[PDB]
């Protein structure tokens, strides 16, 4: 107690500049306000960079929601009309509670949030990337609530491992 698995996101490279901000001001502000460690890494491919967030369950969600706001706000200013999905990366070993019983908890979460949630096919991953991509289509507030309940279920697998 409490759980130590990070939230990993895949965000479009479009919106990374705004998430970091000028002089790294935006990202630092989010780490202060959420007490998180946020690190932005290139990803071998997709035109996306990964964002790793180590914090408490709640600060993680607070940080995720801020990133969703900034992404959506940035999407307005470059006239990006499409809905920007939230893509959570989750290690395959810890997705059993989401995909288990014909994806019951996945569809449960869909219904509770008004989101369309899709998980990348097992076959798509490599030995260099064991993380499944969980794509949540919705909107800022609905994607963030969806992140809370997805990461709850991912942490349930992790904390009931063996």
Residue numbers in the entry: 192 to 236, 239 to 355
Sentences from the paper on this structure:
Research on IMP3 largely focused on its association with many cancer-related tumor entities, since its re-expression correlates with a poor prognosis for patients, classifying IMP3 as a tumor marker. Importantly, we used a very long degenerate sequence (N40) as a basis for SELEX, to allow multiple RNA contacts with more than a single RNA-binding domain, and a corresponding bioinformatic spacing analysis. This led us to the discovery that IMP3 recognizes—through the activity of all of its tandem RNA-binding domains—an extended array of multiple cis-acting RNA elements, composed of CA-rich motifs and sequences with a common GGC core. Members of the IMP protein family are prime examples for multidomain RBPs, where both affinity and specificity are achieved through simultaneous engagement of multiple domains with their respective RNA elements. Taken together, our in-depth analysis of sequence requirements for IMP3–RNA interaction and the functional validation supports the suggested safe-housing mechanism: Through sequence-specific formation of RNP complexes, IMP3 shields a specific region within the HMGA2 3′-UTR that contains miRNA-binding sites in close proximity, thereby protecting the mRNA from let-7-mediated repression.
